[PDB]
mmCIF file of C-alpha atoms in Angstrom:
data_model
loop_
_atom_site.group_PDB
_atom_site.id
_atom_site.type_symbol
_atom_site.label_atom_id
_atom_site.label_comp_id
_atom_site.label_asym_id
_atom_site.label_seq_id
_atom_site.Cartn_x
_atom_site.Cartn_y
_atom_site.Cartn_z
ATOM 1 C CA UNK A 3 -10.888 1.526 -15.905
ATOM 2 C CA UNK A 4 -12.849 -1.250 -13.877
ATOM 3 C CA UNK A 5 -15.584 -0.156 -11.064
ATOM 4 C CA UNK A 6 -18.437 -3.088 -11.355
ATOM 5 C CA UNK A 7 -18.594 -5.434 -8.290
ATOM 6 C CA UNK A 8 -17.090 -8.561 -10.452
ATOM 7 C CA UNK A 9 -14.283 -6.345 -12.156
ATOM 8 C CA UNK A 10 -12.514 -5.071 -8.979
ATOM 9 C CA UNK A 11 -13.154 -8.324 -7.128
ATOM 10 C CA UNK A 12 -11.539 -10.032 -9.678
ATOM 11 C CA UNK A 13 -9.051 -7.327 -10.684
ATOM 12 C CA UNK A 14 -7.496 -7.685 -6.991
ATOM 13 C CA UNK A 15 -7.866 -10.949 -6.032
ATOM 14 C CA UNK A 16 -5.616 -11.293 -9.642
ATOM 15 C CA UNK A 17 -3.611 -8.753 -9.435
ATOM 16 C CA UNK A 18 -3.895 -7.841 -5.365
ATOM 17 C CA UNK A 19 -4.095 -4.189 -6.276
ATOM 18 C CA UNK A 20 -7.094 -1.998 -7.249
ATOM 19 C CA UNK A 21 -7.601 -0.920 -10.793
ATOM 20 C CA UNK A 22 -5.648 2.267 -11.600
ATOM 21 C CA UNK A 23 -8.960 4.598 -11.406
ATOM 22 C CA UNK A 24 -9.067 4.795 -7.779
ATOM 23 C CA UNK A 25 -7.700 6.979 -5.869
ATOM 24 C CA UNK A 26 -7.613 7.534 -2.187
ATOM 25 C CA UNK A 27 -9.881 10.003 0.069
ATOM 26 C CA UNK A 28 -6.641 12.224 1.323
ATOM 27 C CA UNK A 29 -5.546 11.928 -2.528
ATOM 28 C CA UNK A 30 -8.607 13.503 -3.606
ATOM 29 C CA UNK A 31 -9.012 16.173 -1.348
ATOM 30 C CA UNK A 32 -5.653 17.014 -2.155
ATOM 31 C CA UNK A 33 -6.481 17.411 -5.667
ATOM 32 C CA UNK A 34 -9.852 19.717 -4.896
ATOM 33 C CA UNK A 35 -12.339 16.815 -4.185
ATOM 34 C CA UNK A 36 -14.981 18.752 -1.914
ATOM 35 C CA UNK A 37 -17.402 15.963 -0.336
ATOM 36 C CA UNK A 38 -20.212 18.244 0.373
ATOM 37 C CA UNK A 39 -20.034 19.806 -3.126
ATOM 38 C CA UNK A 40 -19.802 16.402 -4.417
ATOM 39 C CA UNK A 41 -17.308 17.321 -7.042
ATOM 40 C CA UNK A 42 -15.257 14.703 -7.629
ATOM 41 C CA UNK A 43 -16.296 13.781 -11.111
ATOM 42 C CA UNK A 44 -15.145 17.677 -11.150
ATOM 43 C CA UNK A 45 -11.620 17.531 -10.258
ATOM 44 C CA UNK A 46 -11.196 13.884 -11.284
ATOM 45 C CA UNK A 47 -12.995 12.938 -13.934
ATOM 46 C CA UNK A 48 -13.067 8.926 -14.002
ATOM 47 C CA UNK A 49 -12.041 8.493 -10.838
ATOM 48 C CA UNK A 50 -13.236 6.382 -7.673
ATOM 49 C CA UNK A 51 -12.612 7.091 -4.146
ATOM 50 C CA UNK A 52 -10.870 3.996 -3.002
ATOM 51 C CA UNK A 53 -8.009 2.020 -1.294
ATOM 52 C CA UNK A 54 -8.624 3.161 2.344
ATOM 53 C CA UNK A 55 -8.772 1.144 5.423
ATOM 54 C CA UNK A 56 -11.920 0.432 6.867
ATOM 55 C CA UNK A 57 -11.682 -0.218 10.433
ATOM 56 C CA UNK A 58 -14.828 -2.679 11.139
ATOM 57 C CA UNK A 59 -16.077 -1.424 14.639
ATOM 58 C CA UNK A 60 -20.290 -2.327 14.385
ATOM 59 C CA UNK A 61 -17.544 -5.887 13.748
ATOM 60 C CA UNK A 62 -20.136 -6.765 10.829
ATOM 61 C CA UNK A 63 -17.226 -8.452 8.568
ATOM 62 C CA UNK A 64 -15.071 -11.376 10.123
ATOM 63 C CA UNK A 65 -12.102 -10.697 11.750
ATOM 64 C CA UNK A 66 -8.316 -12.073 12.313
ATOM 65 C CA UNK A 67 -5.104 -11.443 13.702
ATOM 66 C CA UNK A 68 -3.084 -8.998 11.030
ATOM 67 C CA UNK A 69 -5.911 -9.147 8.810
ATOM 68 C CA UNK A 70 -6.572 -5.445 7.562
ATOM 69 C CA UNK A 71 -9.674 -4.453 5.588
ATOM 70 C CA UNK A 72 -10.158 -2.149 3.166
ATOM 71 C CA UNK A 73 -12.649 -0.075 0.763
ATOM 72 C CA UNK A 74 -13.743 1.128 -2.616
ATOM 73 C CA UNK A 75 -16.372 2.836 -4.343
ATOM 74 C CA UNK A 76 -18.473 0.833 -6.867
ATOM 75 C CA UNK A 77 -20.179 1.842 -9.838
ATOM 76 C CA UNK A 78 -19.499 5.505 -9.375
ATOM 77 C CA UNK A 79 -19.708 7.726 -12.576
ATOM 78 C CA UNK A 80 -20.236 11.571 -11.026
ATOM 79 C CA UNK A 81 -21.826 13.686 -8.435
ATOM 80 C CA UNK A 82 -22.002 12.976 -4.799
ATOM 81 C CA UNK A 83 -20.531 9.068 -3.741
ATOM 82 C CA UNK A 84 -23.057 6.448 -3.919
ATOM 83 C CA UNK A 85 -24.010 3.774 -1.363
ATOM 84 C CA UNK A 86 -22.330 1.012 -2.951
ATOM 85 C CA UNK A 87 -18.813 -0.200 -1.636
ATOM 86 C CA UNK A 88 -16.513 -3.713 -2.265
ATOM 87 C CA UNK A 89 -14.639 -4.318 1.139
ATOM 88 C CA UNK A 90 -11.544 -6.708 0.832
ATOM 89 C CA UNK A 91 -8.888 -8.240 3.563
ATOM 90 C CA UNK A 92 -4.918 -8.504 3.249
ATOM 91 C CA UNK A 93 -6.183 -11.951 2.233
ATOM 92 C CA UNK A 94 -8.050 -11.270 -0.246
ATOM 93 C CA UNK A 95 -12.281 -12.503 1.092
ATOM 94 C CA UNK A 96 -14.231 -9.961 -0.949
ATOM 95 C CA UNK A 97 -17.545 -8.766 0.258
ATOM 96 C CA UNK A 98 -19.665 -5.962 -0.659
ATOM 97 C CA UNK A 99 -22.408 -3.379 0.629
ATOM 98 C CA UNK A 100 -24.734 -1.526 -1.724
ATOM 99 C CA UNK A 101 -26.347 0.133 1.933
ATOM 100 C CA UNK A 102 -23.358 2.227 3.259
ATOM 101 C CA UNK A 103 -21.850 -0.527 5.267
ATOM 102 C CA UNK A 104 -25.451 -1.513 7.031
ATOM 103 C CA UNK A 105 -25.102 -4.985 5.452
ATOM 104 C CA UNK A 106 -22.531 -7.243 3.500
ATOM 105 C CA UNK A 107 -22.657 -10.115 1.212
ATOM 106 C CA UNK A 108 -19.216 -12.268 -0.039
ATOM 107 C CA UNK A 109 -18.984 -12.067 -3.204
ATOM 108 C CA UNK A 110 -15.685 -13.995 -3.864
#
């Protein structure tokens, strides 16, 4: 049960997987999650969207060949997603975004 900035950053660069409360966006909607409805809290109570690839085209976070980037929710409780998001590589740079991907700090 970690979704702060600090404990998934550390949480995968320790264990290079995501806590066990996220889940991804094709999971979700295959368990009812409705993203206009914002239900999720509804159909998965303490759960965080999270674990899908984020492909980087605006080319905001640094690049590499094979390196893959990916995204999860932060500090989501209930009702519709929130703008805040922790981005990490297959090699484990950790950044974040609290603007919907507009701009990104590293945070580890």
């Amino acid at each position: 049960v970690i979704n702060t900035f600090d404990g998934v950053a550390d949480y995968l660069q320790t264990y290079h997987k995501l806590p066990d409360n996220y889940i991804t966006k094709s999971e979700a909607q295959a368990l009812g999650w409705v993203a206009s409805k914002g239900n999720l809290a509804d159909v998965a109570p303490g759960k965080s969207i999270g674990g899908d690839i984020f492909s980087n085209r605006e080319g905001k976070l640094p690049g590499k060949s094979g390196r893959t980037w990916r995204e999860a929710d932060v500090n989501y409780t209930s009702g519709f997603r929130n703008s805040d998001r922790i981005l990490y590589s297959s090699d484990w740079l950790i950044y974040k975004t609290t603007d919907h991907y507009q701009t990104f700090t590293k945070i580890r």
